[PDB]
Amino acid sequence: RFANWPVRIEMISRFRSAKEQTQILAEVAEGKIDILIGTHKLLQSDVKFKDLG
DNA sequence: GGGTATTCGCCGCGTACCTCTCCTAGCCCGCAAGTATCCTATTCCTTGCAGCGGT
Numbered sequence: 001r002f003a004n005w006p007v008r009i010e011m012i013s014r015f016r017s018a019k020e021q022t023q024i025l026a027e028v029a030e031g032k033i034d035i036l037i038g039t040h041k042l043l044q045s046d047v048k049f050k051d052l053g
Numbered sequence: 054g055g056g057t058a059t060t061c062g063c064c065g066c067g068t069a070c071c072t073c074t075c076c077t078a079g080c081c082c083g084c085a086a087g088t089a090t091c092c093t094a095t096t097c098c099t100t101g102c103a104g105c106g107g108t
Contacts, residue, residue, distance in 0.1 A: 014093080
């Protein structure tokens with residue numbers, strides 16, 4: 001759906017490797033991934049959003 | 054037959070007052086309260102075989 005907008009969409013779960021999950025968390029805390037779809041991993045206290053609305 | 058004896062079972066044994074304790078056993082049925090297996094996250098590590106520098 002968002003294939004024609006400047007919006008970054010990323011997925012986090014156990015499927016994503018341990019090497020890229022940390023990268024995704026760094027990107028999210030930095031404030032560059034505007035959509036983050038995730039399972040219960042999102043509630044593990046290490047998922048810090050820059051500006052959540 | 055019957056007069057007698059013997060047994061058996063029923064009935065009976067004071068008044069008034071004070072203190073205290075305790076008045077069915079057990080089953081059932083439904084409440085409800087506390088437990089073994091199934092998926093999606095998590096923290097826990099210990100092996101097997103090929104590259105591979107290096108000489």
